Every structure is written in structure tokens, then in C-alpha cells.
């Protein structure tokens, strides 16, 4: 049900805002100078663009010198309440040359 993120300043993308989406066949990435969702969803002008409980998915995002850097890891789990007590390290996914003044962010959920 959890599927993506928006990063930027206004998040409406009237000025450049990053968007990252998983659609169960691909990951899709956009920065588009066009109006984004006002109350964000997935149904159950793009200066940069790219295309590729029992589970825990971990991510790190950082934004340095116009690059946006992503790390991740996937693991089994046996606790819903708190994060696991053990140690593990995330590994790099992608490193994106986007050049954007990110200060605020929001996750995306699928809706009926």
C-alpha cells in the first residue's frame, strides 16, 4: 500500500519538486514543472526523468551538491511495533543529478 515519495519546497511542483513512484512493474522518477496531487494518491516540463508485518524495507535519502543519493535494504521481520534490535547496513541504489532545492517531503499511499 506504501508506494512512493514527493520531495521539494511547495510539494505542488509549481516550482521543481522531485517525485519517486513504484508501480509494481517499475520504479519511475520525475521532477516535473507541472501541478502534483493536492491530496496525494495512487489508484488501487520534466527536466529530469528516469524509469527502471513480515517484511521491512529500509531507505536513506540525502541531497548533496545537486545530487540526490539513495540507499536501501530489504529484510524479514517479526515485530510491527518497533524497529529490529540487531545491526544491518543499507547499500546504494541510484545517484541522481537533479539539482533541486529540497527542504520538505511526504510519502505516497495507494487508495480505493
Amino acid at each position: 500500500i506504501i508506494r512512493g515519495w514527493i520531495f521539494g519546497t511547495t510539494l505542488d511542483s509549481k516550482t521543481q519538486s522531485l517525485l519517486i513512484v513504484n508501480n509494481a512493474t517499475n520504479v519511475v522518477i520525475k521532477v516535473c514543472e507541472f501541478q502534483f496531487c493536492n491530496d496525494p494518491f495512487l489508484d488501487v516540463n520534466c527536466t529530469f526523468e528516469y524509469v527502471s508485518f513480515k517484511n521491512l524495507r529500509e531507505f536513506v535519502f540525502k541531497n548533496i551538491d545537486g545530487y540526490f543519493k539513495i540507499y536501501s535494504k530489504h529484510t524479514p521481520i517479526n515485530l510491527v511495533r518497533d524497529l529490529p534490535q540487531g545491526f544491518s547496513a543499507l547499500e546504494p541504489l541510484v545517484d541522481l543529478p537533479i539539482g533541486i532545492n529540497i527542504t520538505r517531503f511526504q510519502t505516497l499511499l495507494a487508495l480505493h
Binding site: 511547495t10 509549481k14 516550482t15 514543472e33 551538491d65 545537486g66 543529478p97 539539482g99 533541486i100 532545492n101
Partner: peptide
């Protein structure tokens, strides 16, 4: 303006 940063109007 930061190194390799970009800017586009709105206000």
C-alpha cells in the same frame, strides 16, 4: 545559489 543547484519562478 548552491553548487549545481537550479531555480525556477513561483513567487
Amino acid at each position: 545559489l548552491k553548487p549545481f543547484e537550479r531555480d525556477i519562478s513561483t513567487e
